[PDB]
Design a protein that fits this description.
The complex is a heterotetramer, with two copies of chain A and two copies of chain B. By secondary structure, chain A is α+β, with helices and mostly antiparallel strands. Chain A is built from three helices and five strands. The chains are: A alpha+beta, B alpha+beta. Chains A, D: Belongs to the MoaD family.
């Protein structure tokens, strides 16, 4: 199982803050592809070579491996400061 | 030396933050940066937990590159208004070049690595602020 | 925009100086630098008239290189003690890189072009502080 | 006439803040040489390729021309900030 969090535009488009997905994926990208394929709104939300990801609260490339218990977050380029 | 990291909606005052930063006689140089919002509310969304962790990691890396004394990083969240101060970075060092360099480094990294997102208000609806490639360049140069 | 230049023996407070600097909403970035003395009194001699003129000229040149809003430069004279704040530079700009750059430029030039001389106290007599070639390098790089 | 001011170590060694010299010199360096040649303490004070000069409150090279009415200052490398 992997707990998936969303922020900003990604959150608005998917319509939820978080979801717990009880399935195994090898990488962040594999998870992204399977989530995006649910429906049109999901594909819109998880589209892009700009999209960012964090695993266990560390920014990470999309080839980063996933295991049971990880926290994964998808979000747009940051705009703080 | 000590590090202060604060993420919250409450306003800060440079006049309140400066004395703690400047307390130590061994730190001859003190650099501060304040970033402000330049009618339409801005809201700052963040990732609870990761935001504080990210900020702590940025200061950690700055301490590896420069001999720093006290450091303070404050970033506000929630709804803010034009003119509100959004971010404060304070750094001390024995000498001025380390304080200036580290202060700018911390901001460059905060702008590219800290999970914050700005949404603006405008007459006909909300608009998410766009990130800038120039900030990626500013960060990677270090 | 307005420039404040002060040369005098009286102490300054960043908490007093910051609000004026930060007043304008159009200036999204505010950078400050404070330099301090790190038992033995230090005295700061200066050239009356030329000192104020020099400081004004440095800020003038900074304004030619960067789009600056409000600027404040304060430098103390007379007898000072370890821990005393000796110098303050505050700069504002629309964006952070101009404020950081100009703030450091002003200090680099102040250290090489402003007529001030430091004499220290030490047990067995007074000793004039030696200037550093590294400050000449810091100034000429700009 | 030229009004000559001294600061820091230069001032301490010459034993005065200022002096008005009623004579013409072509350059700062010419003035410096003639002042230095007065006595041992003057030569000590106005020695060096580090020594700085200002004419009318502007830093200046030692080949800078002088005229009647100028204010000239001799002083060590600055150590403010």
């Amino acid at each position: 199982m992997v707990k998936v969090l969303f922020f900003a535009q990604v959150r608005e488009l998917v319509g939820t803050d978080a979801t717990e997905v009880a399935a195994d994926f090898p990488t962040v990208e594999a998870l992204r592809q399977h989530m995006a394929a649910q429906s049109d709104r999901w594909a819109l939300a998880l589209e892009d070579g700009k999209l960012l990801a964090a695993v266990n609260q560390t920014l990470v490339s999309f080839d980063h491996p996933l295991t049971d218990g990880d926290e994964v977050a998808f979000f747009p380029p940051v705009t703080g400061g | 030396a000590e590090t202060k990291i604060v993420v919250g909606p409450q306003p800060f005052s440079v006049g309140e933050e400066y004395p703690w930063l400047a307390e130590r006689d061994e730190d001859g140089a003190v650099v501060t940066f304040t970033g402000k919002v330049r009618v339409n509310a801005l809201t700052l969304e963040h990732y609870p937990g990761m935001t504080e962790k990210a900020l702590a990691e940025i200061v950690d890396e700055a301490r590896n590159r420069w001999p720093l004394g006290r450091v303070t990083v404050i970033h506000r969240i929630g709804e803010l208004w034009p003119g509100d101060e959004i971010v404060f970075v304070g750094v001390t060092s024995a000498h001025r070049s380390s304080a200036f360099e580290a202060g700018q480094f911390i901001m460059d990294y905060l702008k590219t690595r800290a999970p914050f997102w700005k949404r603006e208000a405008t007459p006909e609806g909300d608009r998410w602020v766009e990130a800038r490639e120039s900030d990626q360049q500013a960060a990677k140069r270090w």
